[PDB]
Design a protein around this ligand. Structure first.
Ligand SMILES: O=C(O)CNC(=O)C(=O)O
Ligand SMILES: [Mg+2]
Ligand code: NI
Ligand SMILES: [Zn+2]
Length: 331
């Protein structure tokens, strides 16, 4: 069995290997990359996402989100307070202001310590989930706006034709902006490209051990767990690496830098934080190996998780028994 310790693998595809996306995901899996839940892909040196970023300040962040924490430094939840619209230019200035900028630090490790120690005492502002793309239309390889769609995958594998579309989203981050512990909708894959700016630190639990994280989360957030049997779908819970180690939860960590791709694999729980102003683009995707995960994915039916239009058909086809209850939570 490849990668039995479930380490995060890092790949360096050649320009020839970078042509066929599906093929290279399958190659990574042949090497056991999926066992980690997360892999890093460094693009060949000849590749570029676009010519320059000199022209991005006019993008609008219609609903910036202030991430307000409650709890203790290692175990907290966050809620999103909506703020008034601002341009990327305005947001980048805010990020770099004395109130929000990255503190002096020695290295990534020192900064990680400062994050876990101090995150709860501040409320950074995140420009998340902005439909759009920063890839040049002429970038042919690993262009997140030109991937094969999940609907087409399900049609190819299962023969059914369904409605829905699949497009990428932009994320503008600053110091301490946070992604809570989650798997993707319907336990899909995700791919994330860090277009510019400061790094993003990731934590991941191997898919084969996801239920261990879920058990801990029920223990740590006991009122949340009573309200909903899939409350990690709410994307509000944070658990530090120290707490995970104390409770024996297997996990790994890695820092993504500008110009690098990360792939999350089905049912790979992940969480993390941004080091300073940055812009990432991400999109969900499927492969034939995903279908069995989609069929088993948990669902939030309490009303909180509220998701895209396209998840309907996934639930309808893959999880017909659950569909009526899940849709009640959507309506
Ligand atoms: O970049 C972020 O804030 C969070 N991204 C993801 O969870 C992802 O790409 O799956
Ligand atoms: Mg612009
Ligand atoms: Ni994710
Ligand atoms: Zn719920």
């Amino acid at each position: 069995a490849q990668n039995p310790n479930c380490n995060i693998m890092i790949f360096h595809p050649t320009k020839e290997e970078f042509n066929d996306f599906d093929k290279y995901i399958a190659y990574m899996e042949s090497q056991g990359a999926h066992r980690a839940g997360l892999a890093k892909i460094i693009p060949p040196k000849e590749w570029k996402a676009r010519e320059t970023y000199d022209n991005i300040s006019e993008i609008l962040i219609a609903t910036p989100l202030q991430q307000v924490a409650s709890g203790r430094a290692g175990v907290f939840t966050q809620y999103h307070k909506k703020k008034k619209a601002m341009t990327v230019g305005e947001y980048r200035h805010l990020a770099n202001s004395k109130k929000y900028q990255t503190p002096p630090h020695q290295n990534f490790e020192d900064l990680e310590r400062k994050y876990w120690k101090n995150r709860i005492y501040n409320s950074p502002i995140y420009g998340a989930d902005i439909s759009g793309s920063l890839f040049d239309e002429n970038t042919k390889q690993w262009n997140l706006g030109h991937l094969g769609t999940i609907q087409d995958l399900l049609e190819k594998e299962c023969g059914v034709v369904i409605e829905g579309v699949n497009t990428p989203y932009l994320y503008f981050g600053m110091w301490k902006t946070t992604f809570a512990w989650h798997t993707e909708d319907m336990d899909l894959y995700s791919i994330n490209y860090l277009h510019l700016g400061e790094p993003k630190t990731w934590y991941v639990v191997p898919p084969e051990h996801g239920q261990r994280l879920e058990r801990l989360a029920r223990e740590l957030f006991p009122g949340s767990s009573r309200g909903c049997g899939a409350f990690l779908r709410h994307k509000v819970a944070l658990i530090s690496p120290t707490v995970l180690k104390e409770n024996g939860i297997p996990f790994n960590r890695i820092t993504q830098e500008a110009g690098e791709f990360m792939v999350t694999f089905p049912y790979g729980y992940h969480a993390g934080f941004n080091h300073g102003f940055n812009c990432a683009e991400a999109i969900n995707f499927a492969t034939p190996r995903w279908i069995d995960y989609g069929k088993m994915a948990s669902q939030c039916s309490c009303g909180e998780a509220r998701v895209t239009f396209s998840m309907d058909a996934f639930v309808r086809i893959l999880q017909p028994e659950r569909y009526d209850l899940w849709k009640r939570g959507q309506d």
